[PDB]
Paper text:
We present here, in addition to the independent high resolution co-crystal structure of the full length human SMYD3 with the S-adenosyl methionine (SAM) analog Sinefungin, a detailed mutational and biochemical assessment of SMYD3 function. Baculoviral SMYD3 was co-crystallized with the SAM analog Sinefungin, and the structure was solved to 1.8 Å resolution. SMYD3-Sinefungin crystallized as 2 symmetry-related molecules/unit cell (P21). The domains comprising the “core” of the split-SET (N-SET, C-SET, post-SET) of SMYD3 and the MYND domains overlay with those of corresponding conventional domains. About one third of the SMYD3 substrate binding site is formed by the Intermediate SET spacer (I-SET) region located C-terminal to MYND. The peptide is bound in the conventional manner; i.e., the methyl-lysine is oriented on the opposite surface of SMYD3 from the SAM/Sinefungin methyl donor, with a narrow channel connecting the two surfaces of the SET domain. For example, residue F259 interacts with the adenine ring of Sinefungin and the Y239 of the aromatic cage, which itself packs against Y257. The SMYD3 CTD is a superhelical 9 α-helical bundle which constricts the floor of the substrate binding site opposite to the I-SET domain, preventing the trivial insertion of substrates. In fact, the CTD clamps further down on the peptide binding space of SMYD3 than of SMYD1, featuring a greater superhelical pitch, such that it contacts the MYND domain (circled region of Fig. 8). Close inspection of the overlay indicates that the H4 peptide forms part of the support for the SAM binding pocket in the SET8 structure, whereas the SAM binding pocket is fully formed and stabilized in SMYD3, independent of any substrate.
Author numbering: 4 to 428
Amino acid sequence: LKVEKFATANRGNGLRAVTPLRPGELLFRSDPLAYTVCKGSRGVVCDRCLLGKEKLMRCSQCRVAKYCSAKCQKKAWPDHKRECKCLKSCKPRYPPDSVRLLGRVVFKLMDGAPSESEKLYSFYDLESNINKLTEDKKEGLRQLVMTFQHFMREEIQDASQLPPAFDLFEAFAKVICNSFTICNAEMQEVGVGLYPSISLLNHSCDPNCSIVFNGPHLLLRAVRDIEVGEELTICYLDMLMTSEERRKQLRDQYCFECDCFRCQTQDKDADMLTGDEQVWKEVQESLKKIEELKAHWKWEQVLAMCQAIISSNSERLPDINIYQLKVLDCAMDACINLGLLEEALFYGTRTMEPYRIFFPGSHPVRGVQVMKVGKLQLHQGMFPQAMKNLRLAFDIMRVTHGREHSLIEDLILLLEECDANIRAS
Ligand SMILES: Nc1ncnc2c1ncn2[C@@H]1O[C@H](C[C@@H](N)CC[C@H](N)C(=O)O)[C@@H](O)[C@H]1O
Ligand SMILES: [Zn+2]
Ligand SMILES: [Zn+2]
Ligand SMILES: [Zn+2]
């Protein structure tokens, strides 16, 4: 093990390097203690492997769980067995993701075989911040508790049917500040899970580690050189957020004030907020709907909304503005999913310099973005350009993804195809 739990001065438990670490070094890997497909991806991706398919087969008993294959259906049965009847009874209604997630967790906790996901830190070690919650938040938790009790009612009727140390209210509180959003290879949000060992990592806006998902599986890597004893951190948040926005989310969701170098010095805020507030505020507001559509894989609607914004703001709002940038990114992704590849490259190319600015060093989201643009270029026959970007994507993803991630093999195949096309030209 290259990492260990320790007690920090002022931020609870954390994780630290046992040995010197190099960029790209694998620190930990884990399957989830428990996970579920997220609200917007339900029925779009396989329940088990979280990969999207034109044809998924519904579970016969609930008609809610969907799978890409008989293999996935079977492997998922232990996790699905006790929720099947609960999902069935409430159809077409469907519980919040956290409720479905904790529904799985409670039966997992009764397995006598230790979960690998809990090697460093267990579900019960998870921070709940109970003494820090606002009254409005505690009220929302009590609403969640009631929803769980009703959702689970065919399987569980009383507290005596779960481990004594398990407390439903504190379990929802643990979920708020220890959940991971599982992303597919293209960085679309597809699931949510608990990975208790990985929950040990404290947050920074300039982290020395990063996580990536390959299906439900999580890989933790160093993303720069790290010294013996140094605290290991990850960034909890989207990079395309101002310091005021990050501070709000970290306060509201994680019960802390971020005092990192970036937050203290408003690092990159001026570039993020390029252009006129009266113009970009309208983009920010429009993104609420655009992001929700994207989360539900509604690509035609996303594209329509983004095109309206991109065309109307072209004379006034620069692409480096984070709101304009998010709209370009959504537009690109909508186009890729609809097979509008020339248009996708048009939007993706415009994201390149801002991504270089806002995702410094080695960040998996930038590696994936560069790979997407490289692949589009190769498709469009722009071989020298594609080759530079595919190599750049490799320079990044070798660190952020590593050779244990299946996307690296995919990338190598594109570079070989591009190379062959160059030699043939
Ligand atoms: N940069 C930070 N400054 C202060 N508290 C932090 C920071 N990052 C994480 N935390 C705390 O850690 C919680 C989330 C946990 N996943 C991390 C490990 C946690 N410190 C523990 O003892 O279990 C947050 O909700 C905060 O309570
Ligand atoms: Zn599957
Ligand atoms: Zn079922
Ligand atoms: Zn910060």
